[PDB]
Structure formats: structure tokens, C-alpha cells
Amino acid sequence: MENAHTKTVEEVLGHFGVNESTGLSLEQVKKLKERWGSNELPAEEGKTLLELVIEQFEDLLVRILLLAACISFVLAWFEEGEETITAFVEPFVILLILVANAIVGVWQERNAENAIEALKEYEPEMGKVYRQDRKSVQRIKAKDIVPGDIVEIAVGDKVPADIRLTSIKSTTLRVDQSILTGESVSVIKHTDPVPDPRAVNQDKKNMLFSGTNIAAGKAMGVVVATGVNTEIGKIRDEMVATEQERTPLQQKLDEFGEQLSKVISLICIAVWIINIGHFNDPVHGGSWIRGAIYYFKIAVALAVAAIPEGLPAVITTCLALGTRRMAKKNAIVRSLPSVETLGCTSVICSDKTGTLTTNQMSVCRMFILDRVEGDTCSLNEFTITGSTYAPIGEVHKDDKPVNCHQYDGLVELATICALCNDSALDYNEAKGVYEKVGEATETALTCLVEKMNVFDTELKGLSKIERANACNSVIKQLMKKEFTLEFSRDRKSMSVYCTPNKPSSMSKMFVKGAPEGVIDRCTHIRVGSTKVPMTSGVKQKIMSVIREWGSGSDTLRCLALATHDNPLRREEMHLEDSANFIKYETNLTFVGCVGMLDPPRIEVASSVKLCRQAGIRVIMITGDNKGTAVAICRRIGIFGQDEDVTSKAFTGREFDELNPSAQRDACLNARCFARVEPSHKSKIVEFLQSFDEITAMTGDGVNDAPALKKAEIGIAMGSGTAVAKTASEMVLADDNFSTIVAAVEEGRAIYNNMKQFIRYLISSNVGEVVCIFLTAALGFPEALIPVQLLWVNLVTDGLPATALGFNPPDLDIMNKPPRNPKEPLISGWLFFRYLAIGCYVGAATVGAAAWWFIAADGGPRVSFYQLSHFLQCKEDNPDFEGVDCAIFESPYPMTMALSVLVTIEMCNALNSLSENQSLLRMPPWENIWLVGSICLSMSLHFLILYVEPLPLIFQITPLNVTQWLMVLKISLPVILMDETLKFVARNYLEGISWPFVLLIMPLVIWVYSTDTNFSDMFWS
């Protein structure tokens, strides 16, 4: 089929030799699968490995380090290619950390993509077809569809293949094809040929394209192209990327990064400025421009050292780790930055039917009006056994088997429940169970019709497949369904126009819908076979029985059934818009009600209890009745079993007719919303966000799709509508509601890891800056040269910093209220902690650089005055004898300072496994990646210190054991300093590991054996 849209439906059906009624035979299916193959696209690469690594170098910090690497390379061109290891070692160590972070990030997001694409096949996508093996619609796999078979598309579903539309069962068909044509509006479809052979996909208004979703209406058509021949498979390699919302944590991190860049630039300009004086010294080469290049080099090396270039990499690794941890729990997260939103979510709105309930409905109770005598009235209540879709239940009047032809109202009730249905029952033989084809409510009605068997159809020799829609077919062979006024949620009703087979005008309309809405339009009553005028006492008792059902121990979901006995002809009805449909479902005749059970999921009542423990408020947004909604809320735990819900449960009409005072008190106090349309479902989320709250909407159906896009994160169920899965950002593949608590904990842990990374890097780099500024202030010789600054950068800001993204979650992470998004990223107490640790680190490195000069046994015994005035050290100066300038440029104090800096930052990295939990409670081996990274950094330091040609490159010397002892004596107290800060933060602001104490305590007692203090510290 080359041009399906330009051909009559008769021609497209005759090309394959198919009837829309029966469908494709089994031999035809075999031949067409031999000739066309499976209806599936090959698994192609999500992102190229070159694209994945290039997208790592897009941040501002990575780019400015690339610029600094290019500068250091160009600035090292005082010779035209004569050195390879003594000159170009600075750009190499600047690029090595960038390469390491890029490798880690690429590996993590590759693992996340692999996990996501492996979870994509958790459930095989299905499709409803008509084939000659059965006489009813059947669910096959979406890959088993060959070009030629009939497929009904059944609003809410994803189109499984390119389908030439044949007949539209509803009054209109709206399709959502934004994924293909780009238009963000529902397109109306017809079944007439378009004459243009080269028509674009926007003008193919008689075709359905694979991958698109049905927004409204039911239809069926013949498949014309499957697999790669589809319009979405021919452009599966060409797509346009769309970022979703730029999550509020991302904006915080971006503005923090740019503020940090400004602060670092200011600090570096200050470093270059405070050294303007000694540019003309002969140490630099006896020229002003010679000294300016050296201190500009120090400035750029301090920029590279102080900038947290590993921030984007650790962000992506945290996001990918969260995505993989969620995919292990059968949760498909679409975008990575959306794994964090549930960590700051304060309100979780949830659809009732299909999301909080198992969506396995079954009609448990029903009644018909027995007699009505003016003021008095008597019902006829029945109960039906069976809680699954298997049509093997029984009907009991008073716990006694109902006779064959006692009640005449049951015949009409079955006729209404059978003819006003768009669903069906399908017998899956692979699992040997009956499943729904369509909606759970209509399938429950179908199973009820099968259980009743009002015409006494013999069900002896019928197979498990023929018994699914036997009585339904028996009923449908009696009347001819002319058309269907489809179900609209503003009317909350659905009507079907029926006429007899032989043309003898005896047409009727069968209406089914919400109980109160249908009864408010009922002006008569069907007592047996008599139509009596509807009174007020009967209208009161029917609503009383419906309320008793909804509020009972079963918490039934009720519908009302009516018949319009004298409807208008088709030529007198105007079915252009749905708003007019309610104009024809008037003057009805009440027949009965059916109450169906839909049990809540067993993982809800617990997870709700956890959300309230984490400070999250769970709201129910449902279109069902208020009684049954409040009953389900009490069952799952939103309301107490005897709690007053006067001002905590509302309907759409009640919430609309409220003063802004009460209308703002509701959203902060109400926990249940019933009888709300999709528009109101989205309006509730809009209000909750207007009150500055992070809202998470969970849903399953089409009415949830407008709200799933309004919330900060939408959660769709795996067995839910495809429209709801498109409108959402996380899909629970196994429909496990307790996975939302796991996602909340994962987002909170992601935020905690980001904060610990920020803490470690800021508190270490501010110390790296304080060391330089303190050596410049006291007048001491420069402790570090640019290559040593770049070395401490590569050692400390590298893998030990990215390994904080693998931190374990705190134990009290889900016992705290959610984080306020208006709060600053860094608190004031946190800034105090950063500055305290950094001041200690800087003072420690400056003291280790000054310990070797003043109070070292191997080094000299110079005094503080002679050290701070080392520029005046001359053999002519009377207060300088016994020492010379050759000892003030010694590489021993530079080595001491560098090793103390590396060791104190490796020790501070251990203070960053938790914000307030001590090392005795969370030992370092809880994060084995951090221990490994610290070991590797110390190994690299010891490598450059002792391997033969390395120390001359970094201008250092091998240190003995007596100096490493001082390095550890100075480096360790940062651990107890942060322990003191954590102790202050735990008690005054908001089970220890014995294997850890008995392991580090002997080390503490062995390091401290003597005491060596400096001499006559005047300035500091």
C-alpha cells in the first residue's frame, strides 16, 4: 500500500482482502508476518559516545578550566618545542581531572540509559485486533501486528501502527500527534480519502500514525504499514531534544556556580594585586613583566584550584545513580534531573480510580425499583458473587439463588449494561485469565451481564473464549446500536441510541453515568414493566441507598442506569459538540443502579503513612462521588475512621463556591477532592503551586493528563492510559505505589550528596586560598608554586570529590519535613562551617610551612622575625648571620605545605559522608568509593614524592617518617574540628561503630608521642 490516504476504504480493504467485521485469518497473518516481519523498531543508540562526552564539557566551570589549560599551554611557549615533561606538565594535570570527571559522568549516564532501556521491555505493549480465530476483539502483542488486520484504537491508547481509518464508533475522534507533527493540539480525524498524493502528515486526516495517542473517541481501521515503514520509524533517527522545565534545584546550582565564578575571579585578581610590589625582584628574572607572568600564572592556577569543576560531573552522577536505583524498583524516569523533585515535594495529589485502587472492579451489588406507591416505595436489591473479571459468579436476591424469569427489570438492566458498553472481555490463554478490553467500569458491567444471563443462554459447550462475551452477544443481536453519545466528564454520562432489527419507530436510548447526575434528569421510574412518574421520596431513597453503598465496608463505586423511551431521530439531533449531548439525555426513566468494588492497593495504606512521616501531605483528586472518595480515604489512611471531614473533603462545586479565604484554607487543609473534572483537577494543582508548594501528581487516566503536566512531577501507572504516561515524568511499571516513597528518599539523598560535595569543596578550597593569603600577610616565602597548586587540585578536587556522589543515605532522611525551595542553597551555619574548616586548613598549611623553618630538627632554627623578613636576608645585614637566602627557597617547606594540604583535604573528605552524623556513627567504609579514591590520591602523592624523576618536576623533596608524623599531627585535628561542629549542629541546632574506634584510636595514640611548638609568634 503506497498511498493509503488517497484510496477509498473499500480499496484499502480489498488490497489485503480483509473484512472489518471478521478480520485477518491466521494463514494471512502468517504470510504477512513472513513478508513484513515484526512490528517493532530496532534498538538504536540513544546518545553517541562522542556526543555523551562532548555534553560533559558544556558547563561554565569546565569551560573556564579548558580556557585555563589553553592559557597554561600557550604561556609555556617560551621555547618552540624543546620540552615535553618539564614545561607542559601544568596543562596535562589540568586536563587529567577534566578527563576523569568526564569519564565518570559518561559511565554513570550510560549505565542509567542502559537500565532505562532494559526496563522499557518490562511489559510488552499490546494492541486490540479483530482476527478470524475469535469473533471478538482480542489483545495481541503490538509487535505481532502485520499490515492488513483490523485494529480498534479505543481512546486512551497509543496507536500501534500506521492505520488507515475505516469507521469511527464515537461521534468524533481527536488524536494527539505532537510526537510526529509537532502540533500541541488534538487533531480531528475522518474516514474520507484525501485527494493529495503528496500530502504532509498534517493533511492525512484519515490516517493514524504509530506512536501517537488518542485524545478522544473510539474508532477502528486497517493497518497499512508496520515496523520501519511507519512514519515514526522513518524519522526515528531525526528528532529534536526538549528540556522539560529546568528543575528548581538546577537553577539554584547554576546561579551558585556563577556567583562562585565571580567570587573566584575577584579572589584571583586580589592575589595578583597584593603581589604588585615584588615584581622587580631578581628572583623572577629581574624584570617587571617577568614577575607579572609568574603571578598571573599563580592567579590562574589558584582559579583552577579553587573552582569546583567537578560540580556538573557529580550532579550528573548523582542523577544517574538515582535513575538506576529507581529503575531497579521498576520506575522509568524520563529525564535525569526529575529524580530530585520528589525529594522536595510537599504535596502529593493522587487520582483515586486506577492509581490508589487496583482498578480491578467487579459489580458486587445492584438494585431495581420493586414498587412505588406515591409517598412509599420498595426496592429490589441483589448481590453478585465474584471479584474478578471471570463470568462465573452468581446473583443472589436475599442470599438465595435468583430464579430464571422472576424480575423483569433485570432484563432491562442487563440490556443497558450490555448495549451502553464500549469495553469487552478477553481470555488470555497464556495466563488463563479474563482481562478488560477498554475501561474497568464497562468491563465490570460486561462481566455482570455475563453473570446474570437474563435470557438463559446455554453455556455448556462454550470454550473459555466463547464464554467471555456470550450473553453480551445474545443481547446485542436483539437491537441495532445506531450511534453512541460518548462519555464526557462534564456531563458524567454516556448514551447509546438503539433501534430494532426489523424496521417496525421503536427506538430507545440507553444512558449510564454518575448516580446523582443521571437521577436529576430522570423524570420516570421503571417498576417491572410499568413506567410511573418519578417522585421525591423515591429520589431520596435511591440516593440514600447509593450513599449507604459508597460509605459502607465495601466502599462501592456506583453508577446509575436510565432509558430514554421517546428520543429524537438522528436527523433532528445536533451532535457537533459534546455540550449538546446532555440536551438529549433528558426526561429519562430510571431503571436501576450498580455498585462495583475496586479495592485499594495494599502498598498504599503503608506508603501514605510514610509520606505523612516525611512531612508530605497526600490529597485525593477524583471524579467519583464524595461518599466513596471519603470512604477510600479512610481505608487507606488519609482520614481517621472517625475523623470529622467537614472542612477537609470538598467537591468541585463546593470548592468553586468558596471565598478566597476559605478557598486558600482548603488547599492547605483539605485532603480529598471529589467530583472534579480534569480542568478542576489541574486547577487544584495550580492553586497548590500558587501557595508556593512543590506538587507531585499521580494518575492513570486521561482526566489526569492535564494535571500531570501542571505538577512539578507527574507519576503515571504502568497499567494506565498511554496519554497519562506521555504527560508524566516517572512511570511506575509494576504499579507499586510504595515506589513513590523510595523516589522521595532518593531525591532527598541526591540533595544531601550535592550538599556534602559543596561542603567538602568549599571548605577545602577556601583553605587553599587562606594559605596563600596568610603567607602573603605574614610575609613568609610562597608555600606553593602554580604546578603544586594544580597538583593539589588534581589530587583533592578529583575522584575524592566525585566519590561523594556515592554516599549512603542518612538514617533520619525520611523523618524530616521537606526542604523549602525558597530557602537559600547555603545556610549561614553552613557558611560558618565552611569558613571554620578553611581557616584551620590554611593556618595548618602555613604552620607546616613555617614549622620547618623555625622548629625543625633537620631544617634551620630561624626565628619569626628573620622568617617574616626573609627578603632582607643579606650577608651585610647585621641581624642575618648563620643563615642565607638559599634556605628560604628550599623545597622542603613547599613539600611540607603541599603534603599537609593534600592530607588535610583527604581527612576533610572523610568529614563529608554526612552533614551531622559523626564518623563513629557513619564510618568511612560506608562509602567504599571514597576510601578507594582517598587511597588512590595518597598513592599518587607518594608516587610523585619518591619516584626518581618526579620531585624535580614538582620542585619537591622526599620526606622522611619524622616529617610525615608532623604532617599527620597537623592534618588530623580537622577531623575533630568538624566533629565538634557536627556535635554543635546536632544538639544545639536540631550506637557508635566500635570496630572503627578500636582501629583509629591506636593510630591517634601512636601519632601523638611528643610536642614541638614554634618560637615567638608575634603577628600570629
Ligand SMILES: Nc1ncnc2c1ncn2[C@@H]1O[C@H](COP(=O)(O)OP(=O)(O)CP(=O)(O)O)[C@@H](O)[C@H]1O
Ligand atoms: N464509561 C462511563 N460511562 C458512564 N459513566 C462513567 C463512565 N466512566 C465513569 N463514569 C462515571 O462518571 C463519573 C465521573 O467521571 P470520571 O471519569 O472522572 O470518573 P473516574 O472513573 O475517572 C474516577 P478517578 O478520577 O478517580 O479516576 C464517575 O463517577 C463514573 O460514575
Ligand SMILES: [Ca+2]
Ligand atoms: Ca578545582
Ligand SMILES: [Ca+2]
Ligand atoms: Ca581542592
Ligand SMILES: [Mg+2]
Ligand atoms: Mg483514575
